[PDB]
């Protein structure tokens with residue numbers, strides 16, 4: 001009672017000061033939660049924020065993706081070849097059959113990225129083949145990686161002995177993470193906090209409320225999934241599952257005061273796909289013209305329509321190509337502004 | 345062929361466990377208690393309020409000394425409080441604020457936490473060099489860390505959203521044992537008194553018994569109509585209580601291998617976030633979604649009262665080893681000590 | 684297939700072949716333990732309100 005035990009009370013006071021200052025710093029930062037199905041682009045937007053608003057990637061960090069690049073590469077070629085079996089597609093040149101076997105021989109189990117002169121040639125022979133190409137064109141009929149062609153077309157560069165992933169290579173890589181991914185950056189005078197709970201494959205129900213009160217959500221959508229299914233339910237359309245998700249997220253009680261920002265991503269892939277495939281596949285009752293403008297607009301209207309508090313909340317749609325830094329740079333800037341004009 | 349022996353063998357194996365239980369069901373905990381003098385209704389008042397967390401608090405844990413306690417809030421800080429002087433002994437800067445759990449080591453030497461980062465961070469409170477930085481990051485889980493409990497400075501168990509619990513060697517940061525078995529996110533785990541074994545509540549609406557040394561599931565308890573977020577051992581170690589989304593708390597007996605009682609009441613439909621027993625085990629304390637902590641007669645199954653003093657939900661409970669006081673954590677960022 | 688089934692069977696065996704007890708014994712025992720320490724519990728017994736801890 002009243003003496004030297006007061007030495008701790010001043011430390012207690014010191015601690016509070018730190019809490020205070022920090023808590024103040026914590027009250028003027030922008031928190032963005034990325035959401036949306038797998039493969040929608042969340043991860044890329046995250047990496048974009050690091051190339052645009054922060055250090056980008058140093059030769060050091062870059063060489064540390066060299067394996068994933070090779071892995072993705074191999075993973076991609078294998079999936080296509082396998083895809084030829086299910087689709088009953090031949091090789092343009094029969095000698096490829098041997099290469100296919102060697103692909104699997106060399107490409108051992110999941111160690112890491114191998115990349116040898118022998119394996120490089122093999123993959124190059126396969127990718128170049130007309131049947132493989134014929135199959136690649138039907139990537140809508142099976143699960144296929146989006147950066148397949150990206151890496152495969154650049155096999156010569158990638159395969160090089162002294163190769164080093166470029167920031168693009170890094171951006172195009174898709175690594176499966178299970179923990180929450182987070183990134184910070186300062187931009188336009190404010191500090192930012194962006195998180196991706198993509199790989200957090202668990203019961204959403206348990207942790208969702210942890211984000212109640214985020215500044216805003218950026219919900220990504222893969223426009224090109226309109227003609228894709230789910231290799232598990234078969235009948236379930238991917239574009240539909242995303243909408244269900246959106247409906248859930250959009251009208252979610254925890255997000256009642258949060259700004260919603262749809263990123264209708266993969267517009268570049270959609271632009272090419274819509275020529276070939278009718279939106280009618282995804283939306284049977286679609287009587288519009290099968291053109292980018294009308295089709296893209298239809299989809300936009302479908303998701304925004306899900307919003308039930310239409311008079312209470314506003315959906316800030318933006319069309320993107322997450323792999324384009326310039327495009328991401330610009331859109332984010334419009335996002336940032338809407339954000340301040342809307343809130344702060 | 346041979347696949348049938350196994351299948352058939354399995355099918356019947358369940359029945360016997362079932363029937364065996366049915367067999368032992370000669371009476372009810374309630375009937376045999378019906379005559380006891382009821383606790384009546386005793387009251388509690390807040391003796392302390394710990395202020396210092398900004399965000400919601402998701403977990404707290406009393407130190408074996410019954411005075412100090414940790415608390416994890418998603419404000420990125422573990423604050424180690426002095427429940428007596430209310431002094432902040434520590435504020436640990438988390439490398440990831442998505443903390444869902446915190447544990448205080450029996451020796452008051454360490455403290456642990458983790459969450460959406462899927463890691464169990466061990467903090468050595470004795471950094472003679474000065475203050476604290478992470479000592480060990482126990483990584484292996486592929487789902488959020490829902491709970492963790494040190495056995496002793498050398499070992500700690502963790503439950504995870506990836507449906508498993510595990511035993512780790514702190515000294516080396518390696519994973520000792522993988523307790524597979526639950527088919528749903530493991531929300532809570534409870535260390536038996538002798539730290540010999542533990543139980544875990546999950547989203548598959550089942551609790552389980554595990555042999556720490558043997559690393560396998562002994563018994564499996566069912567009955568909850570929804571997820572289980574809290575699990576707690578009856579002081580003697582031959583029973584335990586579980587908290588659930590189905591708005592109920594339940595007492596299960598180990599030796600009898602089944603549920604003895606359900607603690608429910610109409611006009612109470614929110615989920616339970618935390619459970620705890622009084623020093624004697626007569627009272628069962630459950631932290632509720634509706635900002636309150638409800639107190640029940642662990643033997644009689646009625647409401648002995650309720651602790652109201654929170655503005656957001658009660659997310660975590662805590663009874664001192666000396667049974668002297670109760671602690672409550674809340675989404676409202678405050679912690680209270682009740683007597 | 685076989686490897687999984689066997690893994691299950693052996694687990695079932697583990698829970699099935701255990702030393703069980705009847706409720707009344709189990710129940711009474713708990714009721715017992717409670718009534719046993721009923722005095723050594725500060726949250727039941729409004730202990731010497733003087734200065735102890737809080």
Ligand SMILES: Nc1nc2c(ncn2[C@@H]2O[C@H](COP(=O)(O)OP(=O)(O)O)[C@@H](O)[C@H]2O)c(=O)[nH]1
Nearest residue numbers: 038039040041042043044146147172266321322
């Ligand atoms: N062509 C193209 N590729 C994209 C686009 N957005 C992302 N990607 C790729 O499609 C795949 C999935 O993206 P990712 O960000 O990994 O999705 P997440 O699973 O939601 O994180 C990756 O190969 C990305 O590089 C886009 O707009 N166009």
